[PDB]
Every structure is written in C-alpha cells, then in structure tokens.
Amino acid sequence: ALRRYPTGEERCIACKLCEAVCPAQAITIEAEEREDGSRRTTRYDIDMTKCIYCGF
Amino acid sequence: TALNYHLDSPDNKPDLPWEFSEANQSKVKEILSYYPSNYKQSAVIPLLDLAQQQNGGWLPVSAMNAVAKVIEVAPIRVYEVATFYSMFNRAKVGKYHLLVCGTTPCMIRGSRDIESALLDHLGVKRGEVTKDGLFSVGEMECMGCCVNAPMITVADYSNGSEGYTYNYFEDVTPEKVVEIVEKLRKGEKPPH
Amino acid sequence: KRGEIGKVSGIPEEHLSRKVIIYSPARTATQSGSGKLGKWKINFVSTLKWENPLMGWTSTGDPYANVGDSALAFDSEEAAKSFAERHGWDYKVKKPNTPLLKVKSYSDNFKWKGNPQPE
Amino acid sequence: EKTHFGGLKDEDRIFTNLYGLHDPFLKGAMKRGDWHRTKDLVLKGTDWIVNEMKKSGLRGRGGAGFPSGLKWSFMPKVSDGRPSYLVVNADESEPGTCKDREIMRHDPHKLLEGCLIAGVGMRASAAYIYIRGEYVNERLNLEKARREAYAAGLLGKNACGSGYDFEVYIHFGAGAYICGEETALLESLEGKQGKPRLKPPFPANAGLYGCPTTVTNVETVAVSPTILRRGPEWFSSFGRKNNAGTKLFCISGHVNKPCTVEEEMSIPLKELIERHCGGVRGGWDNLLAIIPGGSSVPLIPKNICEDVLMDFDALKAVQSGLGTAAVIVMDKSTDVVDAIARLSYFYKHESCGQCTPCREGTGWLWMIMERMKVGNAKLEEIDMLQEVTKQIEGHTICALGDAAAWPVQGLIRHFRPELERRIRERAERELLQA
Amino acid sequence: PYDVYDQLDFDVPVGTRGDCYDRYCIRIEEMRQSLRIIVQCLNQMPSGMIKADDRKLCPPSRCRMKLSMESLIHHFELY
Amino acid sequence: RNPVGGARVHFSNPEDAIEVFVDGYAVKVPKGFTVLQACEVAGVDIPRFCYHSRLSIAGNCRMCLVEVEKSPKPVASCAMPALPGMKIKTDTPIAKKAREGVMEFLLMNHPLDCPICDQGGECDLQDQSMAFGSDRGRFTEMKRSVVDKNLGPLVKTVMTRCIQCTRCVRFASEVAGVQDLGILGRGSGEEIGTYVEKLMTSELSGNVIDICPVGALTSKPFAFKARNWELKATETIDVSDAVG
Amino acid sequence: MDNQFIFKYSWETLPKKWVKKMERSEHGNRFDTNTDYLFQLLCFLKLHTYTRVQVLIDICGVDYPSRKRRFEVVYNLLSTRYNSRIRVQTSADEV
Amino acid sequence: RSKKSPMELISEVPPIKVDGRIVACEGDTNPALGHPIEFICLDLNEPAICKYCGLRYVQDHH
Ligand SMILES: Cc1cc2nc3c(=O)[nH]c(=O)nc-3n(C[C@H](O)[C@H](O)[C@H](O)COP(=O)(O)O)c2cc1C
Ligand code: SF4
Ligand code: SF4
Ligand code: SF4
Ligand code: SF4
Ligand code: FES
Numbered sequence A: 001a002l003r004r005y006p007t008g009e010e011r012c013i014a015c016k017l018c019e020a021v022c023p024a025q026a027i028t029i030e031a032e033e034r035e036d037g038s039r040r041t042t043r044y045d046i047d048m049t050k051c052i053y054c055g056f
Numbered sequence B: 001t002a003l004n005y006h007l008d009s010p011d012n013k014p015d016l017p018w019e020f021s022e023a024n025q026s027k028v029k030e031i032l033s034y035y036p037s038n039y040k041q042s043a044v045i046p047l048l049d050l051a052q053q054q055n056g057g058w059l060p061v062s063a064m065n066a067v068a069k070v071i072e073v074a075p076i077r078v079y080e081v082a083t084f085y086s087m088f089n090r091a092k093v094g095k096y097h098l099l100v101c102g103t104t105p106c107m108i109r110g111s112r113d114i115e116s117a118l119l120d121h122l123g124v125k126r127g128e129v130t131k132d133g134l135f136s137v138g139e140m141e142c143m144g145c146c147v148n149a150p151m152i153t154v155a156d157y158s159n160g161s162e163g164y165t166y167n168y169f170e171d172v173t174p175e176k177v178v179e180i181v182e183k184l185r186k187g188e189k190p191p192h
Numbered sequence C: 001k002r003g004e005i006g007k008v009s010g011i012p013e014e015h016l017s018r019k020v021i022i023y024s025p026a027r028t029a030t031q032s033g034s035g036k037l038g039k040w041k042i043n044f045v046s047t048l049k050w051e052n053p054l055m056g057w058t059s060t061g062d063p064y065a066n067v068g069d070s071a072l073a074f075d076s077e078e079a080a081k082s083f084a085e086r087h088g089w090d091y092k093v094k095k096p097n098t099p100l101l102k103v104k105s106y107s108d109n110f111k112w113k114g115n116p117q118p119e
Numbered sequence D: 001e002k003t004h005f006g007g008l009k010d011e012d013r014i015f016t017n018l019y020g021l022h023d024p025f026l027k028g029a030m031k032r033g034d035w036h037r038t039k040d041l042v043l044k045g046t047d048w049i050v051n052e053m054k055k056s057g058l059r060g061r062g063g064a065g066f067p068s069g070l071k072w073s074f075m076p077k078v079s080d081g082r083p084s085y086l087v088v089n090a091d092e093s094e095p096g097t098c099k100d101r102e103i104m105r106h107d108p109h110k111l112l113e114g115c116l117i118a119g120v121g122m123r124a125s126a127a128y129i130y131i132r133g134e135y136v137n138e139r140l141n142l143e144k145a146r147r148e149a150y151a152a153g154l155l156g157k158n159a160c161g162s163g164y165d166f167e168v169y170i171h172f173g174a175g176a177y178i179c180g181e182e183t184a185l186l187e188s189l190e191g192k193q194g195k196p197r198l199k200p201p202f203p204a205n206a207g208l209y210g211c212p213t214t215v216t217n218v219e220t221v222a223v224s225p226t227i228l229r230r231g232p233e234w235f236s237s238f239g240r241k242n243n244a245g246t247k248l249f250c251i252s253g254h255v256n257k258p259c260t261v262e263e264e265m266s267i268p269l270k271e272l273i274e275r276h277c278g279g280v281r282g283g284w285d286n287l288l289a290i291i292p293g294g295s296s297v298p299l300i301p302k303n304i305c306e307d308v309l310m311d312f313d314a315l316k317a318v319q320s321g322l323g324t325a326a327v328i329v330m331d332k333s334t335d336v337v338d339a340i341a342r343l344s345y346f347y348k349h350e351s352c353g354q355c356t357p358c359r360e361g362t363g364w365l366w367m368i369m370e371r372m373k374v375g376n377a378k379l380e381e382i383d384m385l386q387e388v389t390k391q392i393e394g395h396t397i398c399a400l401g402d403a404a405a406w407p408v409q410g411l412i413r414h415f416r417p418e419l420e421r422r423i424r425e426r427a428e429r430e431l432l433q434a
Numbered sequence E: 001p002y003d004v005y006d007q008l009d010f011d012v013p014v015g016t017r018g019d020c021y022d023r024y025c026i027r028i029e030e031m032r033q034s035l036r037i038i039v040q041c042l043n044q045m046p047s048g049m050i051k052a053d054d055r056k057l058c059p060p061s062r063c064r065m066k067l068s069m070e071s072l073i074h075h076f077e078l079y
Numbered sequence F: 001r002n003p004v005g006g007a008r009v010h011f012s013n014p015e016d017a018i019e020v021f022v023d024g025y026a027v028k029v030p031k032g033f034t035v036l037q038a039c040e041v042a043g044v045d046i047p048r049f050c051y052h053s054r055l056s057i058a059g060n061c062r063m064c065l066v067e068v069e070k071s072p073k074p075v076a077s078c079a080m081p082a083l084p085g086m087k088i089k090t091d092t093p094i095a096k097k098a099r100e101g102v103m104e105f106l107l108m109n110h111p112l113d114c115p116i117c118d119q120g121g122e123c124d125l126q127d128q129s130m131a132f133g134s135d136r137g138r139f140t141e142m143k144r145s146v147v148d149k150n151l152g153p154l155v156k157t158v159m160t161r162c163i164q165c166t167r168c169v170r171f172a173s174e175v176a177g178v179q180d181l182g183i184l185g186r187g188s189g190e191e192i193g194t195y196v197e198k199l200m201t202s203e204l205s206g207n208v209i210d211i212c213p214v215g216a217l218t219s220k221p222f223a224f225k226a227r228n229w230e231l232k233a234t235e236t237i238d239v240s241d242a243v244g
Numbered sequence G: 001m002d003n004q005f006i007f008k009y010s011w012e013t014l015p016k017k018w019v020k021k022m023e024r025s026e027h028g029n030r031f032d033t034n035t036d037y038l039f040q041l042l043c044f045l046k047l048h049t050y051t052r053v054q055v056l057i058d059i060c061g062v063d064y065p066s067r068k069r070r071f072e073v074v075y076n077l078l079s080t081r082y083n084s085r086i087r088v089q090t091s092a093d094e095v
Numbered sequence H: 001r002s003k004k005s006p007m008e009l010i011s012e013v014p015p016i017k018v019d020g021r022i023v024a025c026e027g028d029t030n031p032a033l034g035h036p037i038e039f040i041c042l043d044l045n046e047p048a049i050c051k052y053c054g055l056r057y058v059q060d061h062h
C-alpha cells in the first residue's frame, strides 16, 4: 500500500530507494518535476508476481 | 533584516541612474591617484564609503554599479565587497544613524541597558527609519577598551559627503540618549 | 580470429559473429574520485530494445543486454583482447583518454600584473 | 635590574604625549624630538638599520611576537622589477584594545617617521597605512599629519633631502575584524574581500599586488625611529633577555582606574595592576580571572596570576599569550561562562567564513556555550567542547580559528567545576519541578 | 562451535547399528536436546543491543535517520 | 605503481625533478607540483572538495590535510608545494582525525534531503563521508537555511546544500569568462549568488552542474527524472558543432 | 590439529614439487598445486597418519576471465580425526 | 473527493504562521512517523514550501 499524508499529499518522494533495494526487481518507478516543482512519481507499479514479500 | 540579496524596489533598482557629483569627482580622482592605474580595484572601499556618504548613509544598487564602472570591474565584485563589510548599509538608514548595542568587553560595565529606552522613545524597530526620516538604530562596532560602557555612535548623513561625521559618545545615560537625540532633532551637535 | 573456444563454449553461432568494442570506461564528470578506473570492458553494442505495450517496461531480445556491464570485466586491455580473440568476436579497441598533470601552484593566483602601461 | 623587572622613569618612556596634553602636529613633534636628524639615519644604509633592529631584539607588538629585525631581513635585497611595499597594520579590532588609536591620535609623526625608517630598512618604495574604518577622526588627523609631512619635504621624492623616494598612503577598512590579519589585510587593500590567504606563499615573496611586502604593527613601526636614535643597548636593557623593550598596556575591566600605560616588558601582572591602576575592585581577594592579552589569548586563573611576568615567553609557558597586552580583569561578581559565551559569539560574528572548521566550528562552539550558560547540557558535553576545540585548532587557514578555540579551552582547563556545578543545579531544579 | 553454543549444555546422540531405526531414534533425541538448548537460551538471554554498532555495515534507527545527517547518509548508502 | 586515473606526468627536463616520500615510496615529480599532485603520482588519492585540476587553487574545505614531518600542524596538500626530501603521511592518525573533524563540520548544517537530492547516488559529500568520515553525529542544535534563487532555465538551485567550496565562482571567473557569480556575505551566513536577479547567460554555464560536488547546483531539465545507477553510460562524441 | 601445526607439518612432509603456493591464515590454510599433481596430493593427504583427511566436503569452480588459466577448481577437505579443514586449489582453462 | 489530485489537496492547506525566520518541518506530530527533519528559511514574501510534505510556511510578523 502507498500511504499519503493526513493533508492528502502522497508521501512518496520518488527517491527510488525502494527500487534499488528490491531483491526481486519487482518495482518500476518513473518520476519528474510536478507543476509545483515537487519531486513526485508519475508511474509507480509493483509486480506482485515477482514480489517475494520480504519487506525490504 | 540584513539580506545577502537584492529585491527590486521603487527606492533602489539598477534602472535608476547614479553619477557621483560635480564636487565629488575631485575626491574620486584623489582616491584613484593613490594606487597604480592597473590596480584601480584597490580603491573600491574608499569609493563605496564616499557613495554611502553622498547618497545619504546607504548604498543603492545603482551606486555599486557606478563604482564598478569607475574602477572598471564586474559589478559582482563590488557587491561582494559591499556585502562583506559591516560599515556599508544596503538598506535605507535614517539621516542620523545611531549605533547602540554593545559588545563583549563593554557589557561587563553595563552596555546592554541602552537600546530599549531609545527604541521605545522613537517608536520604530531597529533598522526602521522614523516617519520624518531623521533617526535609525543599528549595532555598533565597539572601538576601544570601553572604560565607559554606555557608548553610542552617531553617524551623520545630513549634509552628505561634506558634513558626514562619525562620533563616539562616552558614558551616556539611558535618558541622556534621549537628551542627545532631542538635541540632534533641532540641529545642534552635542560634544564628546 | 581463432574462435575455437567460441565453438566449444555453447554460444549459438548467431551470437558468435557479433562486433564488440573493447574500451576502458572513463571517470564520471560529477565525481572527483578515481576508484572505478583501470578496468576494461567489452561493449556488445546491445541497443535493440523497445517498450512493452502493457506497462511501458523495456523489453529486449538480446541475451548480451547487460553481460559486459554486470559480470564481464577485465583488468587489462590484453586480457579483453585475448577473450574476444578466443570467442571469435570481431573487436575494436578504444584507447582511454588520460589526464595530464600540469604544474599548478597557489602563488599563481597572486601574480604581479606589471608596471602600469599607458598604451 | 634583572631581579626587579619593572618601573620606567618618565625620561625612559618612548611614547611621550600619550595622554594628549601637547600639540600632536608637526610643531609638537619637532619640539618633542620627532623627525630629528632623520637624514642621517636613512643615509647610513639599509643593512645598518636591520643590524640595529636585530641587536635591539624588538619582537613584534601585534601579538605574534616575531622578532622585527629578522622579519625585515626577509625582504629582497636586489629588485627584480617588482617594487617592495611596507604595510602598517593600524586596523585594530580586538575587543578592549586602545593602543594604536591613542598612538595615531596623539603621535602621528612618530608613525610617519617609523614608516620612512622601516621603508628604508626594507628597500620599500611606498607605504600603505591601513587604518580601521571606524577611526574616522584618527584617519583625518593622520591625513593632516601626512599633508604637513609632505609640505615640509619629510616625505615624497627625496625624503628628508636624502635621495630616498618614499610615498606614504592611507588606506582604511570598512569594519571587519578579520582584516587585521596579515594576508586578509592585503586582500582588503587589493580591493577584494578580506579573506586570509594560505601561508606557503609568504608576504615577503608574494604580498601586495603580487610584489614582496611586509606587514607590521603600528607600535613596532612607531618605536623604530627612536630605537636607532637612542640606541639599541638602551632599548635592550628593559625586560628579560629574549623579549625586551617597553610595551603599551590598555588595562581595563574590574580595576579601580583603568588606563593605558607604558611599562617595562617584564612588569609583574600583580604589580602592574596594583601600582599604576588601583587595586582590583574589592581587593586582590575579589579577583577571579584575568585575560592577559585580550580576546585571542586564553584565560589565566587567580592561583597562577600570582608571580606571573607579562612576557611573550612567560605567559606562553603558562599556556596563555601576551597578545596585544590588553588585560581584562574579572571579579567573582561576574559569570565566567557568560563571558566565554560572549567571546564565542564575537568570534562567530567576525569569522570570514572561508574555511570549513572556522565557518561552522565557531557557530557550534557558540551554541554549546549558550546551552551551558544556563546549565542546559549534560556532564559529557564538556568533553565534546574539548573535542570540537581540538578539531578547530590547527586545521584553519588563519589564526582566528585558534583564537576562537583558545577561550573555551581556557574555561574548561581552569573552571570545569563551575560548569559542572551549574549543570548539576539545573538538573536538580528540573528533577524537583516535575 | 559458533555463536554461544559453547556456553550451553547439550548431549550428542550417537547410533550403534546405522540402520533407519537408529536414524529415527537420533532424530528424536536431537529434538529433545534442542528443547533443552531452547530452555537454556531463554533463561540466560541477556539485555543489550541486537546489532553491531558499526553503522557502516548495519542500518540506522528510523528515528536517527530522520534526525541526523550522517545516519541518513548511512541509510541511503546501505539501501 | 601507477598514478591515480592513469595520469601522465610531463617532465620538461630530467634535471628539474625533485624526490618525495608519499608513504615511504620514492616518487619523482617536477618542481612546481603540490603535495596532492605528488600523492596522485604515487597512487594515493587524497580527499578533496574545493580543489579542481582545471580551476585555481583555493584551500577552503580543509579536507586534503595531510601530515608532514617538518610541520607542527597539518598542511593543505592541494596548495602546499612539494619540496625535495619531504616525507608526506596520509594514513596516519593525525590526517585521519583531521578528515573526520572536517567531515563532521561539513555535515553539520547540511540538510537531511538525500532522498530528494538529484545528487543522490553520485555525491562526493556522502561518498567521502562513508569512506573518510566518522559514524555518529554529535550535532543536535538547529541547522541554518537559505532561500533558493533563480539562475535561469538550465541550472536548478538549492543552496541549502551548498558546502561553500567556491568552485562555481572560480569557474565563472576563469573558465566561463562571465563574472556574474560570487560569494556574498561573511561568516556562516555567506551565500553564493549573483546579487541582482540575473540568469547565467554563458554558453558554458551548464558546466557548473558538474563542478559542484553536491546537489546545490543541478540540471533543471534533468530534475528528478532518474538516478545515476539506472543509467547506461555510452562514450560517444559530439555533432552539434565541428569541435567534436 | 590446527592451522599452525598442519602448515608446518605439510611444509616438511609433503614433496616440494607438488605444492607451489601455501597460505596460512584464519580464513583457511590453502594449497595450490599443478593439475598433474592433484590426485597424488589428495591420495597422500587421505592416507597419511598425521593428516588423515577422509571427507571431501565439496568441489567448486571459480571463473576468472582475466587469467590465462581461466577456471579455479577448489577442493574443500575435512579431517574428522584431527578436527581440521584443508583447502586445495588448482587452475585449468576450457580445453 | 477522489476528483481532487494530491497537488490540489496540498494547494488548499493554508500556510502555517511562524514568528521566527526559520521553522523545522518534520511532517507529523510524532517525529519518528514523518519525514526527515527539514529546516525552512522564511526570508521571502511568498510562502516557503517543504520539499517533503508540500506544506507551506509563511513568516508571521516581519
Ligand atoms: C584575526 C586576526 C586579527 C589580527 N588583528 C591584528 C591587529 O589588529 N593589529 C595587528 O598589529 N596585528 C593583528 N593580527 C596579527 C597579524 O598577523 C599581524 O599583522 C602580524 O602579527 C604582524 O605583527 P607585528 O607588526 O607585531 O610583527 C591579527 C591576526 C589575526 C589572526
Ligand atoms: S520511491 Fe520508494 S522508497 Fe522512495 S519515497 Fe517512494 S515509496 Fe518510499
Ligand atoms: S579561520 Fe575563520 S577567519 Fe580564518 S580564514 Fe578560516 S573562516 Fe576565515
Ligand atoms: S548534496 Fe549529497 S549529501 Fe547533500 S542531500 Fe544531496 S546527496 Fe545528500
Ligand atoms: S554552489 Fe556548489 S560549486 Fe558553488 S560553492 Fe556551493 S557547493 Fe561549491
Ligand atoms: S559598548 Fe559600544 S563602544 Fe563599548
């Protein structure tokens, strides 16, 4: 699950730190600068058929 | 509110022209004559202070560009010099800039009991010019062994570069500061 | 090329006629460290990739997509050349560009301009 | 004598008219004895002047304490096209220092003659006097003295009618304490930001405008023309062997009548305080700590203020410094932690921010000192102060980082029980509240 | 021995005939001895931290990565 | 042994070539080389933040401090000239402790924004902090901050991450030739900026992204797009002009 | 029994022409031999009284494309009687 | 209100008044459950945006 702040803003900052640690390469992230200039993801998709549910 | 960057305002902006004067050109020539002609940049401080006195106690961005043209360097160097040194006012100070709050050696004898009385007397915060445009409050650079702790520095910009005077007043009472300010308002200058 | 090892290795004959580039990767411009230098790599020029028309993933049909970047590394140009020669790959060698250490002194920041010349 | 070091007669003083009772202009200078047979001194050769300075054993009065004659001997002897410069460092900005101001506003012609003599002794073609920016009136007085000297022929082309061509100029800063350092002064005088240079290029080889130059204090320059005239043997007969002469002291702080006075180089601190100035406020028992030589030098507690000699070497052996010799007497009626935190704030404010250890370490020291000013720290924070001061020292470009670290080390070395006591009482008041 | 196995008391069962029945009996005895070792580990387990203090090789605490610069750098580099 | 990065030392003459001991190893360097360059010849790579081989020397960061036998205090190897018979020491406790002290000072007011920094996996500050730095931070007080300024459509600016190495200023003054950037202010409050709202108009202005060791200066079009570890590097030449 | 004893004993007892590289460390006492002396070395180390190595733990290969002899074959050995481990390595190419 | 994107939702939160020149944003009341500490300088006229939360902080008086 992807969480968001209580204000309604998504917490993901497109740091790709989860994509680099994923031992199964199940995460693909695409990011760009939003209209406000904030670092956010455009595409964040997880392969649940590659996921090994390790919690890394 | 000392900021290391400039926001364009009606008071100061690069579009406004700024030459020195007819009377101040001889001073510029004399200042430049002290250094070799290939090292005109060495006369940036004695020219910046002259611009500060002439303009009225503060340096608009136009004055810095004029000084840069006179010494023939990039204006960023003059900005670097102006922002580094603490005697160059980049915000608009009052006609009689008053320097009050002390330093380390001078507060042992009680130099931190003088700013608030004047601040509430003239009724505008530090770095804020009064409505009539006469007085301002700033932080002094204590100069000596400071035997008499309550010292106030009075920078005078009433007559420009011809009547600019920088005095230190020793042992001034938190009400004697009001006395000397009232004397300054009329026009008379107190002795030291 | 005596690509006998290529014949007794198991690589398919289609991939044994590839053209590769032997080169030493240079230091990145965003870092001043020189730790990832001195190693030689074989570039298979594997550019045939496309986009998956279901999720936008990068698809490929080239087995040598990342072998030369991931596992195949050599400590010298001679080792890479011998490897390519034994595997029967047509190779070209790109000699690395190396910096030249010039004389630089701190006192050069403060150098006399010379006597004022009214030229 | 050797056993009793201290006590100068009125005749043996160098800086007459130090109190401003007489005319400081050219008339008073010639009647007092300035510009007296200066042509003879210049016409005796550059080498003779350096020899006399070396014999007199004049150590630097700017705080470093380096011998003046050996410093002047470092200047090039053969010109290779680069003119030699002399720079007089009048930009005194140390808190509680009043010496160079009093010299420039009461004896300007002593300074001018000293500049001429030093330029002759270093083969310098011009002299720049760098005055502190706040000394506007002193700058005007010295400029008037310069005009009088030029009008009388004592300076300029054929100075004193001796064939030497010496030009004296008056530059001034704009309110920076770092600009007093040798290389930062050269940067400021070159029209740039007053940020010190790195030392491997020395000023004697690449200084002002990339030309060889020498930066000297006003006091060292001012006493030069009278050492030659009176005699080095007379000058060397004051103070101990290695460090000799007469030096000005601006005594301030908790003393009855603070003043500036000239005394032998080896005056005892107790005798100095209790002889010229009055006794310490509340008596010598009220004494708690004395700053020996101004802000830069560390602190000295009372137990070792007894039988201490105000020398360059004696104070250094007590892990302190003579510095500018501007003592700051502190009583038991003052919080030492507050004073040291204020020194830390001063050094945070005056750091030029060029190198990493001083730009950040000074601020960190100030914040920790502010926290301990009210005991809002743990007992293990003092060790962190020691570690941070040791990290700052020795890694900075100039000596302001060392000057910023020394007061904290002095506070920890001699007043650790006070810091622990205030920390403990703060902890007790926190525990007994909730 | 590795870890704290040399501070624990347990027996090593040994067969006599080598058949499948001895294997089964030894597999029973080993599991009983593992129960014994578990009891000893529960009784003697001390207090303290659960990782090496060299944060160059182990992750920082989630409260320290969000409060200290070097802890955040270590977290980034490790992950 | 070989020089770091395969650097080629050009000896104009064999006569003018001093000898130094970087770590007990005899090294021959021309007269004029610095201690850092002599170490580079001897295969030892000294940490650096403000030193660039194409820019003038300015010993600001104090990160390249080493030990010299005839020196009471550590010397900045980037600016100290090499002398004949000089014995350098790099791995000694003095140089080490200096390096951790300097790293601790540098990481004191640095913002905790590695995840959102475009210099994430390619930062010299964190790479050297892992290698030559310490493990635990003793700093707990409030950090400083500065506002961000617009330098144009090419250079994205986050000056909270500035370490004040002045490499951008030196590049603008020397290589670019357009003097519009400089260090403004004094002390910890000093800032890099152009003072008057102006944009970097130099055709070589984009090179300040590379010379910046931290994420203070980053590319604006290539903002947040990808991390360096995701990118395959191809060594190609230019076709925009005839310089190649 | 231990790495300090096995190293010296095999230095003295073993024929010199077999082993060409001996490492004695805490990571493991290794022997490097030519491929034509491997069988002889292991037969010696399996039958000698003071080096009774009777368990072959595993055989693994390591790939070094930068070497002339590309593959490194490692023989991890165990001696139950003396509670010691010995590693023997050789090198061979593809043919 | 799924029609509102997170950008519009974070653009509707009024800026937080801060008296000082600098504010520290952690992202949540409990520090351990938010984002890394972020110090924001309020020396401009426009509100200052946190680069993690998107929350805007504006200086109160001067
Ligand atoms: C931060 C700093 C400030 C200094 N300020 C002064 C000063 O105001 N006056 C002075 O004579 N020396 C000052 N010095 C010492 C200078 O290095 C001085 O020019 C040098 O010691 C020569 O002094 P001398 O004339 O006694 O030989 C300062 C040094 C530092 C590091
Ligand atoms: S990219 Fe992954 S690790 Fe980074 S903030 Fe988003 S979910 Fe977390
Ligand atoms: S120690 Fe401080 S004053 Fe001296 S150069 Fe470094 S930052 Fe500037
Ligand atoms: S500049 Fe480097 S250390 Fe600083 S936030 Fe960016 S990646 Fe992290
Ligand atoms: S912006 Fe980058 S290159 Fe410029 S001084 Fe700051 S850290 Fe150095
Ligand atoms: S308190 Fe300002 S001159 Fe002393």
Ligand code: FES
Pocket (backbone or CB within 6 Å): F047, F048, F049, F050, F051, F058, F059, F060, F061, F062, F063, F064, F065, F076, F077, F078, F079
């Ligand atoms: S690289 Fe030498 S001090 Fe910065």
Ligand SMILES: [Zn+2]
Pocket (backbone or CB within 6 Å): H025, H026, H027, H035, H038, H050, H051, H052, H053, H054, H055
């Ligand atoms: Zn936030």
